[PDB]
Design a protein around this ligand. Sequence first.
Ligand SMILES: CCCCCCCCO[C@@H]1O[C@H](CO)[C@@H](O)[C@H](O)[C@H]1O
Ligand SMILES: CCCCCCCCO[C@@H]1O[C@H](CO)[C@@H](O)[C@H](O)[C@H]1O
Ligand SMILES: CCCCCCCCO[C@@H]1O[C@H](CO)[C@@H](O)[C@H](O)[C@H]1O
Length: 335
Amino acid sequence: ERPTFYRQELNKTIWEVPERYQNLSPVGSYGSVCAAFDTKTGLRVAVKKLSRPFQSIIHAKRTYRELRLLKHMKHENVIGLLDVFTPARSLEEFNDVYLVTHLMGADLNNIVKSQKLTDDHVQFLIYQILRGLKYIHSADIIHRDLKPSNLAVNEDSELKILDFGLATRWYRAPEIMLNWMHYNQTVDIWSVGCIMAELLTGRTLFPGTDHIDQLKLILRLVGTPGAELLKKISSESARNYIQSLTQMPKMNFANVFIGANPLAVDLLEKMLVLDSDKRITAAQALAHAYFAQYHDPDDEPVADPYDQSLESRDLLIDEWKSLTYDEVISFVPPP
Ligand SMILES: CCCCCCCCO[C@@H]1O[C@H](CO)[C@@H](O)[C@H](O)[C@H]1O
Ligand SMILES: CCCCCCCCO[C@@H]1O[C@H](CO)[C@@H](O)[C@H](O)[C@H]1O
Ligand SMILES: CCCCCCCCO[C@@H]1O[C@H](CO)[C@@H](O)[C@H](O)[C@H]1O
């Protein structure tokens, strides 16, 4: 049975939603988001209305990509779908897509507020990110822009990784900062280390003022490339410049993170290595003794493989639109 919808105009735009979704209230901004109450489940939800979903080939492709990812993501620490709907009774009138998920209510700034968390709290939060990253990475997905605003947290400090959240460079791996084009999964591990550091200290690890200051600040802490790492640089210019650099020594992290759990420090040394091939993975981080009170190797699930070649095709608008439509139709709500 097609549910009954109703119109309403929020934050200067019309929203058409099923009746189960009551008390819509804007929470901010590829779409706008309202908090709402789901009378069917009894749950507070975030409802996202996609912005101009089928206006261009590029918008259509993105809508399809977002819809497909979110439908795939089914893990406690990763944002997924409670519902996806359209007013449309058929493909001919299909022009809007609404996405529904748990309202978390806060991201990792509202929960943190620039202060030191306790070690226990830090463990809990980083464990959750890594548990979610393991899941993500097993589907062969690199996040690439992990930061506090891309991490949704509720009151009980239960955390979910967000595709897109509601200073944006402080958490970027050096190789992303330098527009390398062969990233590995440990670009996300770098971002986790920056986040972990800040939760432990109350302070941004690398608050660069601009692009170059950021890299300066990273080199100060991790040192300049060693010889094994220079051997992996294909760009002659990059190579030349690094070789012109005055060798800088890697700092001792026990002196950077004064009074932190020695296991936290050890873990940060394994996350924040210049050479991405030498960074601890999310699976390995989960087994690190720092997360002893939370680690359960039998409840750290992995994803089904995800076909991302389906989203990087070159299709006509009406083809993406029709493919996106079928995804809406095929959607099965979680238990
Ligand atoms: C929905 C649960 C989180 C999934 C994380 C994927 C977020 C996708 O975000 C995308 O990630 C790509 C990485 O492949 C980047 O190259 C893109 O620029 C970015 O748009
Ligand atoms: C002068 C500043 C040096 C920045 C060097 C970044 C080192 C990151 O490490 C490198 O990551 C590359 C991209 O993912 C990989 O191809 C390499 O295997 C890896 O060593
Ligand atoms: C992977 C290595 C990337 C090369 C980074 C380029 C650094 C540019 O950085 C700038 O370099 C200028 C000339 O080099 C100088 O005027 C400045 O001292 C410096 O800030």
